[PDB]
Amino acid sequence: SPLPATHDLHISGSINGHEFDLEGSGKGNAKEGYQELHLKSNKGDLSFSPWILVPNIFYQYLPFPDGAMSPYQAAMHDGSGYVMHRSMQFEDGAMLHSDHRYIYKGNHIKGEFRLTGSGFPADGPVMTNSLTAADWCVDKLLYPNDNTIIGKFDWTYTTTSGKRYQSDVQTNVTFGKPIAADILKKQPMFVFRKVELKHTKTELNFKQWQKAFQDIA
Amino acid sequence: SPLPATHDLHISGSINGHEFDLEGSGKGNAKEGYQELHLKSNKGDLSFSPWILVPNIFYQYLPFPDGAMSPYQAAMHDGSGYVMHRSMQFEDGAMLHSDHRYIYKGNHIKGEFRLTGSGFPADGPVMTNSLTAADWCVDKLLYPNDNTIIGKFDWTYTTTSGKRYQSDVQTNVTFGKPIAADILKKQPMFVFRKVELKHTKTELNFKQWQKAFQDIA
Amino acid sequence: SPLPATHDLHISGSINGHEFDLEGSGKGNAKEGYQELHLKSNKGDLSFSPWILVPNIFYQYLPFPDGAMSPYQAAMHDGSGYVMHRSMQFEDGAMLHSDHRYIYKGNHIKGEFRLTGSGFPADGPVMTNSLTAADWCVDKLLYPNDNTIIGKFDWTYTTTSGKRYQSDVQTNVTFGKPIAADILKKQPMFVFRKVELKHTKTELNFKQWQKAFQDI
Amino acid sequence: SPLPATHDLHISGSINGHEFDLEGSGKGNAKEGYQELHLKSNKGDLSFSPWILVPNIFYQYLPFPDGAMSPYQAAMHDGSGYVMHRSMQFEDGAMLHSDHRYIYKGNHIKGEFRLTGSGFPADGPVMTNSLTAADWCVDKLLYPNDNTIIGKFDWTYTTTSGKRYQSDVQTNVTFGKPIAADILKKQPMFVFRKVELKHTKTELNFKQWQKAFQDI
Fold it and tell me: What DSSP assignment string belongs to C148-176?
């Protein structure tokens, strides 16, 4: 493959015991780090805030500094691939885990994601649609061995009450083959991201900007 | 349904990116809290310690104090059911999540479990088969609303080096209908458990004893 | 050196930046695990729930099963002693850590505890004095080496709104001499405890029951 | 009240039960974020890696973007001040918490920091003095109310074995007066920092670079 230009996603699973299923497609620009995605529900109205599906709704679009391939891009490029496993531990006792798999077809990516979330309080912000936005975020990546990224960030939404809603997020990424030694010696690597989400009860339109950095200006 | 007498399990997923799949059956005694289970691999040798599959490898076998039905037993009994979502956060950066679903057929239970584990160090105790046993365990249960248990325990194995291997484990249990009000007013509830596991690279034989308690002698 | 029959406590530090200081005296039964304590404020009215000072307000009162001494008691008995370091990580972002020291004078314990708690939201149950009780509790103990206990429990209060207030609690205990081999080989050890607190803005009246168990 | 140009530190407490006490002096540039510090032990040779005292070894040196004062600096500037409470939760079960206070005398800061660390395994990198450097670091800051900062970062050292040593770090900062509205509305704020440490068993020589950012 070359760098990605387009992608689709089928994402499904359950939140508080209630099944959900979405699909759609999007595109992005793998040199800029930007991507956008449209999703539509296959099982009626979502009963939970669509914002809970971020960050889960494609780091193949993410370059590393000075136009280098991120390990994600490299793994797409030679076709050896990777999977991700993410955990979100919310401050109010909720948990959401996800598994991420991909199939490549030239410069197009097909994502299959499975999520399980539970323990969202009936009156907390996820079940009342009270999440309003996700804060700008710094992701910290380390490679504890040659085929794994352990990444972390503190994830916060703003909400309608003005109180933020917090979780600890950890993403373990497992590669089909060794990450290039030149990527492995620049640790830690950070990535600054911004997202937007417009949404109804049945549809999402998401956009994301990403930029990797070892150091700041 | 009545109380369970027998069960089978199909359990599958991936550990460090490597797929695994097991099935088998067992039985137990729902008044005593005891159950045993035999499992066999459908995909060759496990490349990870089988002990990592405990606690994941049926609280329907668990009575509450003085022969009362546990909420698990009650949910089987009227057929309204429940699911579980468990998270294990290991001290060395590994994570393992699981989703648990059941189907009842009279006094027989069919479990379908899906697990994703990742970030196990190549030289840590899971990938070297160095777990030797699981410590006796106290599970602490609360019901933050009428259809959910949030349970927790500190989970430790002994290992061949003599160092214990630790994780934080949280199990969120989501019920199809409200838990009985008489169960909901006895919080917290604790459960003392013991397990044994004999195993090879392709087969497991597990046993478990459980006893619920609000207070001790 | 005898098992403890009476004790004093001086506990101080700050909560959300506001200094506090209490002292008092109590007693208990080291064969049974029970003790009780009275504390009075030296700096005016407490600005936070006094319940936040539990569990921090003496495991020298705790025996082990079958009349054995707990490690806490043995270290009092030989004078070698120990310190505790405790951390409470609250679900709403607050943190409270404490440092515990003791002087023994025959059967009397003097505690000097220093505490820093911070980050408690102005409308949370601690700052609105809305905590009503602490749930009964199981403490899981391990000894990762011969002079250290690492213990954990999930700590929950009931509150006036009905919704519980939770924290993760880790207590590390460090001994001046090795723990006896016979205690070391019985792991985990669990301890079941119940507490009561009656309080006003200046005074606390605390009781506790505790009992070690390995199995039920 | 001027921005800081020099500072002293007295830092004490215990690690694994062993008391330690250091003092010294340093300086820095409050327009640039840099500061450096020298510390000397008053109680003999340290029995643990001196790296464990970082990050704990002065954000009054930290400016905010475009020459604005950080909240730390503004609270020095008006004399209203603040305290910090920090917690480090290590991957191997150790815990280290600290309490930070300051006295200001014109452009000079006096710090008094109290620390308790415990649970560090005898064969871990802290007790074998095997920590070699601290990774560069991004601190995420939020203000859940008008006098409080709640900050977090994942803290990692490199060690002689090649394997990193990790901890979760939460710092709660409490202000004697409200933070300015204009600082409050810019959340999150991030801070990028680099540190160096040269040390012997009795002496530390510490430098730090820091720079706030909202975006890159």
Answer: EEEEEEEEEEEETTS--EEEEEEEEEEES
Distance from CA of B166 to the nearest CA of D (A): 9
- Phi, psi at residue D33, to the nearest 5°? 90, -15
Residue ranges of the alpha helices (H) in chain B? 71-77, 181-184
Dist CA A137 CA C145 (whole Å): 40
Nearest by Cα to A72 from B10, A64, B45, D106: A64
Under 8 Å CB pairs connecting chains A and B tally to 76
Could A172 and B118 be called an inter-chain contact, meaning their C-beta atoms sit closer than 8 Å?
yes
Total Cβ atoms within 10 A of residue C205: 16
Which residue of chain B comes nearest to A97, CA vs CA? B97
Closest C-alpha among A84, A57, A54 to residue A156: A54
Task: Find residue A189's DSSP bridge partners.
Answer: A141
Give the CATH number, domain containing residue C131.
2.40.155.10
Q: What is d(CA B65, CA B43) in angstroms, rounded to the nearest whole number?
A: 41
Q: Are A157 and A51 in contact (CB under 8 A)?
A: yes
Determine, for residues B144 and C164 on separate chains, whether the beta-carbon distance falls below 8 Å: yes
Range of the domain at A101: 1-217
Q: For residue B66, count CB atoms less than 10 angstroms from its CB and return exposed for 0-12, middle for 13-18, buried for 19 or more.
A: exposed
- Strand pairing partners for D201? none
Locate the chain D residue with the closest alpha carbon to C17.
Answer: D174
* DSSP assignment letter at C9: E
Token pair listed for D59 = 């954000």
CA distance D50 to chain C (A): 20
Q: CB-CB: which of A152, A156, A217 is closest to D154?
A: A152
Token duo for residue A106: 């030239």
Which residues from chain B sit within 8 angstroms of residue C163, using beta carbons?
144
Q: CA-to-CA distance for B77 and B184, rounded, in angstroms?
A: 18
Which DSSP string corresponds to D56-80? T--GGG-B-GGGPBPHHHHHHHTS-
Helix H or strand E segment including C184? helix C181-184
- Shortest CA distance to A48 belongs to which of A155, A157, A135? A157
Q: Which residues of D touch B92 (CB under 8 A)?
A: 91
Name the strand (E) or helix (H) holding A75: helix A71-77
B105: exposed, middle or buried (C-beta count within 10 Å: 0-12, 13-18, 19+)? Answer: exposed
- State the structure-solving technique: X-ray
- Copy the structure tokens of residue A16: 């508080």
d(CA B139, CA B192): 7
Alpha-carbon distance C42 to nearest alpha carbon in chain D (angstroms): 22
Q: How far is D83 from chain C (nearest CA, A)?
A: 7
Q: How many structural domains does chain C have?
A: 1
Q: Residue D110 half-sphere exposure, CB side, CA atoms within 13 Å?
A: 6
Nearest-by-CA chain B residue for A117? B85
CB spacing of C16 vs D174 below 8 angstroms? yes
Q: Mutation test of the interface with chain B: which of C140, C142, C171, C185, choosing the one with the most B Cβ atoms within 10 A? A: C140
Residue in chain C nearest B216 by alpha carbon: C216
E strand or H helix at A211, and its extent?
A: strand A203-213
